[PDB]
Amino acid sequence: AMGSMERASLIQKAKLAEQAERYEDMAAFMKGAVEKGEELSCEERNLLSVAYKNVVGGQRAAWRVLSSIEQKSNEEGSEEKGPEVREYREKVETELQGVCDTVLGLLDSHLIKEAGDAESRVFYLKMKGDYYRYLAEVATGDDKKRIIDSARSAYQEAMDISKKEMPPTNPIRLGLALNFSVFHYEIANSPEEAISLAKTTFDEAMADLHTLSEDSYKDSTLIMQLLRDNLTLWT
């Protein structure tokens, strides 16, 4: 749908969509930019991830509402409404899945293959881990296990690279750790691992802060605070 628009026009429109909180549009513009076949810049990767994060974020929030209703209507002494709650939860779930598959597909051809620099490769592998994780949040079937492992292996590979190649205060490194810790906590049923990861990550970033310019690491600061919020919630 975006094949007739210049790459630069798609990037510009993704930035306008962001300002207008039109995240579906933003995601469609960024998909079209990716499909031009050139690697994305640091700024363009951020637009890509923000667009899809917001689209799936709204779907996942809806899915959680509908799932909670559905689960309530399946309890002790709740009364039979009929199939509507389940159908509508399935409709939202299916659309969410289709957006995850779209992102995963863009990642696998060809953001991940062509990413040589550490900051881009870790960024894309983090996205791959995130979107498999959102698949795992709704998976109840045969392949829940395989989906969970796909998220784990993406996050693990990102983690391996980020440790070798990036400082501990790098905001991509920090975000990856934050999300991988969430994965361990609520997807992999490994809250000790989640806690240990969040703590180690936070502590190592604190100790490396002396190397940093400020206010040039406001992203790193915010993410350190989310790690702290999780540690507070979980301990």
Partner: peptide, 6 residues
Amino acid sequence: KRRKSV
């Protein structure tokens, strides 16, 4: 308080 991700 729902746990944070980014």
